[model samples]
Target chain A: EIVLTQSPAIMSASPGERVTMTCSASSGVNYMHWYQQKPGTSPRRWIYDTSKLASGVPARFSGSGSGTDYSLTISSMEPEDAATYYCHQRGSYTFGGGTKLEIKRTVAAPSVFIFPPSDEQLKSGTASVVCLLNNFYPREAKVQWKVDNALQSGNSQESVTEQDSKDSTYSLSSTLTLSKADYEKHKVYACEVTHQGLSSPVTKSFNRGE
Target chain B: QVQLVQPGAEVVKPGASVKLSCKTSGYTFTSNWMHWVKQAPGQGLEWIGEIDPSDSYTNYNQNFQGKAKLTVDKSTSTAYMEVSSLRSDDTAVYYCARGSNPYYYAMDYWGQGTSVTVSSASTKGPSVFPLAPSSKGTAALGCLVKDYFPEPVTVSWNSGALTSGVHTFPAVLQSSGLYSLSSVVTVPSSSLGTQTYICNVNHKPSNTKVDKKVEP
Candidate 1:
């Protein structure tokens, strides 16, 4: 059985940048094939028979090499090109683990905003504040709630980040609920959002008695 | 558009031989190459071989040469593959595809897969059950299939096979020598109404198609 190894399991690239990945086979092979797969979809053939490009593939995407080593290159990467690329060799049927291409683009930093308790909630003795984290990139953010600079934990709901198709940005909402008496005792409620794209965590505070 | 149409599922006893066909259209059959690939139950794709209908020239993966034989008939524009002396491990979904040439082309069009299941014992149909949804708001449907001899069975939703958002786990060998597997299909909640979604378990060996429905 021929074993295939794909390098740089994860690759981050910017738009218009030239990107290349290699697939090395344990032994000499007649030809190699490549496939591109995205989440929740079947793999689509990209390059096959060593270096023949599949029909409809853009000119920027090219394949080369022979025998034990082969490569797939993108002369100018496109944002939509982000996907997992897999290599296939016919001998004994072996496939590489796949190289994931992530297109890096400048994105707006996430902003945090907090909303005070609604009148209905205050009257019902269940006071809660809503925090909005908007316009973030990469879809990963660590969120925490603080009461008067102290870590607040319990019965808080944080929704999964939802990406906006227009700008490719993400947004999510987190809510912190507290007893009306406890809400009065706390001077302020703060929502802190930490993201890799940011130098420091973004914090937004809501006045308790406002 | 080029199209490769294949016959339905096949069932044969171990040690016997069976030939599957792939009829194609929209191109000169003699000018292109046909490739055969297979996927064992709950496994990835494995290349079998390639054949040129023009002169019946062929090349095969060394491991599969003895197990699979590739041929073609130019008259009907069809390619055929015959597997001889089959074993239980031969149970898989075989696909035929059209490539550009003998040495420098990739498969462009593919046929709907033909499932082949080889077993010596009489076929035993599986019992299909519906389990609770695994996640919330996603309208996910779970199907539990078990106790079937000849582990290769096809599962579908509402009689249609889904490629995306449907996950079928690897079949596990039971102590009694039977097999079991779980499958889940996640659909958009809005697309689901009061309609009951059916899980169809097609077991070719028992010649039975069992269905279990989950009401939303």
Candidate 2:
């Protein structure tokens, strides 16, 4: 039972651009298994015969072609890799049908941005917030700070920048400090940027003293 | 598209007994279920049970339950399995299947096998020896008939003495019309040694009688 097909349902690369997705097998299958679905989770086998690598799955996600044409690459672009990517057809017994890898809107820009922390330093109790990340290709970045939206747990900070390979741009900055009674019951604060082609996440919010 | 045809190859002897047949064609032959498998050459595929020729219901295979016996015949859709006593390891190879529904379990179609063999025969009148027994001498013992078939036949000797061990015989016909008669004489394993050896066959001498014993 072999009959699997996967093409770019949607893909728009940009930070060191380089994306590829294609899995086809209707009757020449030798092995082509790759999976990763994350909107509710439960689908992670990540390449089997068409490039092998299904143990922990993460060499930057790679799988080459063989037999009936296969490919599942994701070398650059980061942002959690934007969810949804499937391709199946292994050693037949019967159970095949899967393919999807979406994220096109020019790769959906607007990485992250947030700013809040003033009013004479919020009465000098000390509380601050300022974050703005963009593009962020293979630089591995993470900036999380959320208050009204909950999740400011032990503050957070992740930064990376030192790869501009001519605009394959990469930047990160995160700051969050509270204790004005937890920053006056928290007014607002949100900053999120995780890369690898963005997989359901991209936030930015601010407002607490203007 | 349904089809299952099997029937060919059968050579019985050792206290003989055999009956195999499976024939079905096209579809609707009582609608569904009809299985029976046993492949023993390298071994791995044994499930001799399943029959539903429109309400005959049968299921055995806990290692052939009590041996084997499953029947069916909605007119002639055919399906039958019979094996008793026999021996020589019971030979092997028997199939007949067709199930994709009717809860007949797996096996979506198969049938192309039938190989039966069970040997050990005896007849007396025109002579037709070979009742297995290549010598373990003593003197004064009887009973060793295979595949009789001639109406009421019986032989018993559950270990020596045979009441008095003198002689009392009758029933022989072997010009190849196949009757059943194989005689051997030897006794005194010290007065019966470890007893247990019987053979009884009665096509209906008032019924009841199909015993078989040989274990001591």
Candidate 3:
């Protein structure tokens, strides 16, 4: 059996703060695999070969480092990704043990509000909210909308717009909209964005009430 | 896909013995050598030995050399091992195995285990006295029987009722006319307290029978 050790039993940070966890193997391992495990559930394989995400895992959670040491970095923290994460290695036979990310606390940035349907949009009850999130890796993210604290139910769509940075960092954004009954439930809605790069997620809630 | 189906558990007394069998399926019978392993409570695997059913070649771990005998039947693709002089320590889970073709060093496949237990005897049989005494009492004794297969049978006497003791009598089987036989029985100082004893012969169908005698 291979021994794996993780540091910082718990972590706390604001929404935009970057956080990292390290996993070290007892002996030199050629390949390291990462997984995210929530309480009371089986761990899901996240990153393998030090930097590649398994199919379906968002690109936000990026892996790096080699030899005995490996690290999983969340660019900007996201609330939905606040669960614990782990790392494992494959060779000879597959042996895995993982680390976790816990959401200690979060403080949202100042709120942004939009009012009285724009003349171009009022003509057509159709309205749009485009959230611009930057410095994301893997470029894949899921955008969600919520009413008050309850998740808003409606057809929401997200698109990946990429930009390259000199520092080798990548950025993308997701846009979601509400129409018909979804628009009536609340003139204000919150956008929750998740990508592998962010330890925690960025949330912007807009409300007509405000 | 390979599958191994094993025999059931056996219960015997300290002085008695038992044999277990393991059957294999889904693979060529003679292609691989069959091995046996023992797992005692809290202990790691114990390699008993291996038998090549095709040629009858056998190899046993030095530790289990005297404890187990390995044999196989190519005609039926079945392997069998009979353990003797069973004691409480002999009670364990035993498995049948096949070696990987190129990698014959370790066992890659295993059979479900059969549990064997050695306890006190529950049955009793009639008494028979020695036809002749050679020593101050009788140093050792052996028996000879009729038609048989591989080899004839050998008999040994144990001092306590139902053959209980450390010393054993060696017997040899011969394929001759009627059947020539001779046995040597030892009268140890402990024999003064002896009450019931047994004469056991190694053979098929019935291998052992007890003969009780009341001191005169």
Candidate 4:
């Protein structure tokens, strides 16, 4: 039984581009398994015991490396192959966290939701806010915050966008941190999401209440 | 190439039990290991256990410890799985696969999965009675059994053996996911003078049975 670790948690490639993903074990592993899991379906074992390909798998996909080191490579990427790949070891029957291989595409508008500060924060003259943007297609997107129509920049601590395999959608969050006194002055907050594919930015606004 | 045939959908009561069968052919049956795999409607794949034909040795996944039992019949080159203490949580699709080699095992082929659903159990066995289909001196009699759930029923007669003339109808699915099937048996009119012609329905899951007995 050994701990298996995978790297380059996420990546993307255009059609025909070669991509490689790696997995390492804490100790020597007698055999390693690789699986391909597309959206909304069961995982299919792509490579078993280091190099043997499962039935109907293409020659473009190959498994190599061994012991503490292992790799599953796709010599020519395909659009239909966009999905997550996982590594496993039968000794302890452990699985790696998983890595995703995405296809290049335009990003879609992100759905924005906001949570305002607590009563304690308002009374103490500070603000703690969270903005959630969900179900956007394609992983490339950004979130920005503004107060009274002016961009407020500091540390918003935006998280990495996460993809939902069920519907092939991506989601992420951005936080708004400031003093209550600063928050109450102009009283209006707005969030804007930008993606390269967007003709115009997607925006959502929030206002304080009595 | 090898192929495996799975049973039809099953509908049973929670806390009851069910047995599933997978028949394989086109290759040497006793030469490979038989394994079971499970997938809840929207969940991932789980390997339940495997039984070796060579030594009758069985291995299990700790997650399914007492919940699933695996066995094989070399005679039919078929595999059997019995899942007990059924719960809503146990409702899922089960598939059987064949082994790739002796020292190492990998699944390259799988049987189409069979679905098992758990709802409240029905009241009792099907209504059975003797019908008019007679001939010559001995009446050509027929008995119809109806309304039983969680299929794969064992319909047996009280005193005589039934062959050739046995006819069972297609299963009608009930609203609760249960199934109703009709099975028929025949005997001579003289043998039925005062004796009751009984066909017992044994629904293996809950150990519940019903006797469809009709007197001539």
Candidate 5:
């Protein structure tokens, strides 16, 4: 069992520029893997072994290095490339924090809001939560829904990102269907936005003001 | 109308062991299973294990193996969780809830959490959601308990008996590096009477159980 540590754990690089991160092992192990994850979604294995691309990954994502030092580099970045990159050791199967990529320097954190269904609508087995993503940059942000504080997935139907006619921003929305007992209680429905702004993610609560 | 009653508060010292208790009443005590839970400050709910007072059979969480013991008093209709070798980390409120689902015992009846404080003090127990459950189909039911600490809460979907198993779905990891659990259970209306389903949520922060507690 070996230990792995990642560097440049959080970074913001512009579009088309090369983004690189390194994972160093405490002892040489052959089970190094790389992944790309946006908030709200699960991680995908982008690189395998020391330097091999996984299934359908584009050639732009590459891996290299040997012994205890490993590298994951994006040949060139795209706006869609804004995400957190991480490396793990399949041997011990432990991963590191994250190496976040930002297409723009000061991307405005998306304004998140939740629209719960009416009390009457909550009578059914399920209710809808309109997770609105407005006024964001790069349009590559990620969002997730929580009932009470538990993460709820699979029931969400997402809308494509649309450009705003006003001051030029991006907006996307996802409708999360939750259990009725959930929305009618002291439950909290929140929209967590992970954009390139501050160091970490910024979340908005629908129950706070209500 | 079975009820789980625990002590108001306890103040123990480090290295001291505490045998927390949850007394029962209102319904036939031997008819349901009892589960003990541990919660630390702001961590997720941990399922220590459970016991059937009528049979005296006990189950334990891998992490709580040998650390905590589960027992019950059939004569008194009370369940007990004895945590030994107390540490600052063990300083948390403990709770005992009632579950009836043999397939996937989601908690149908829960007591107001009994709080405990270590560091020469005391803390409060668990918090129940919605307070009560209503029957709708096949005598089925659902319930949720939250704010239990130390992460890793296990629940159910498919593992009961005679179409009545407990399925602990994926629990969500909360802001405090803890977990939030939602336990769902469905039992065929056997006799149409009020049937009970019991569940145990053991939070250990291990990988295999984490997905089962947090993910679908």
Candidate 6:
């Protein structure tokens, strides 16, 4: 059995950008093929026998290279073309680890969630509220806390952002601490998220003690 | 609209010959060709051969020439692959796949795989896996018993008063010459519910048993 290895297991490209993925085989073989699999469907044969596009595949999609090395290229990426592309060699029946191609767009939004203070904090007379922004993209974002319709400055930690490996998206978490008395007086706390990808900032409000 | 349907798995003893079938519909059968692909348990796909249904023309991969035969019966729009003198290593999943138009090598449409398990393979213990409930709806917990040889296994759920809803599928031969089976049990939701479900798999002949514990 020949082993096939794919490079850059994950990638992102804007629409109209040319993208290419490389598949290398452990030993030389006769023919190489390609397949495209969406998130929840069976794989569709894309390119086969090295460079011959499967029927109905767009002209923008092409395959090239031979033997130990083969490549699948997309001349201009389309939103619908965003899928995991796998390279396979015929006769030997070996497949490479798939390359996940994500179409770069600006409208991905994060799901916002607010967590109220726990019982331990309430017992200690201090409360910490947390704001979580999940599944956002572009990575450049910030979170701000508002109290009584005014922005509060201190006791808030810097927002932490991390990218999700599966989707290549970003998530952020920010927390603010205040005295229980202030929490009751504020009545309402809001988290405002600002990102370049979002046309407008997203704001979610949580009532204290809810 | 084009589709390929294959029958169920087959269990045959070593030294015996078996013929597998693939029925096609929704297109001109003779206009396209069919190919057979072999997948050993835990392995990749291997091309066995191809057959042109129109005139019974066929081509075999050099590796499978003397071991397998390909033919078609255009009357019923079906394709067949017969392997003679089966051995322990011949146990694997066989697929009847169609190629894209003009070029008969795309694997555009695939038939549901038919697993062939040859008797006399070495005995191996079942590997149990727990399947978690990842979605909402009727909660169907799964227990996967995989990579076992000489397939004769019994699955039972120990849920006391909730023993119903257990559905176990037939054992499938893998590319590695082993077998895999899945058992799923649905649990109704409740407010005050916490139940520990255990899936017990008992493999016969060897009397090897494995248990998978799942809490859903």
Best by DockQ: 1
| Residue-wise C-alpha lDDT for candidate 3, range B66-129, written one tens digit per residue | 7799888766678898888888789777778676564312344566677665645332221122
- True lDDT of residue B202, candidate 4: 76
Compose the digit string of candidate 4's lDDT tens values, residues A35-59: 7776434456678878988888889
Q: In the order shown, what is each candidate's alpha-carbon RMSD?
A: 13.7, 37.6, 36.3, 22.6, 19.8, 16.0
Instruction: Indicate the worst ten consecutive residues by lDDT in candidate 4 chain A.
Output: A159-168
lDDT of 4 at A149: 85
Model 3 regions lying over 4 Å from their true place: A1-210, B121-216
Predicted structure with the largest lDDT when compared to the true one: 1
Candidate 1 share of real interface contacts: 0.19
TM-score of chain B of each: 0.63, 0.27, 0.53, 0.55, 0.53, 0.63
TM-score, per-candidate, Cα-based: 0.51, 0.21, 0.31, 0.52, 0.32, 0.47
| Per-residue lDDT value at B7 in model 1 | 74
How accurate locally is residue B160 in candidate 4, as Cα lDDT from 0 to 100? 43
Worst 10 residues of 5 chain A by lDDT: A160-169
The lDDT, on a scale of 0 to 1, for candidate 1 is: 0.74
Model 2: per-residue Cα lDDT over B64-173, one tens digit each: 66678988877888888888887867777777766446231234456776866454443222211112221232323333332354323544444333543222233333
Per model, kept true contacts as a fraction are: 0.19, 0.00, 0.00, 0.01, 0.00, 0.16
**Lowest summed lDDT window (length 10), candidate 6 chain B:** B131-140
Tens digit per residue, CA lDDT, model 4, B34-82: 8787767545456688888767898887778899998888889888899
Alpha-carbon error at B120 in model 1, in Å?
4.7
Alpha-carbon runs more than 4 Å astray in model 5: A105-210, B1-216
lDDT winner between candidates 4 and 6? 6
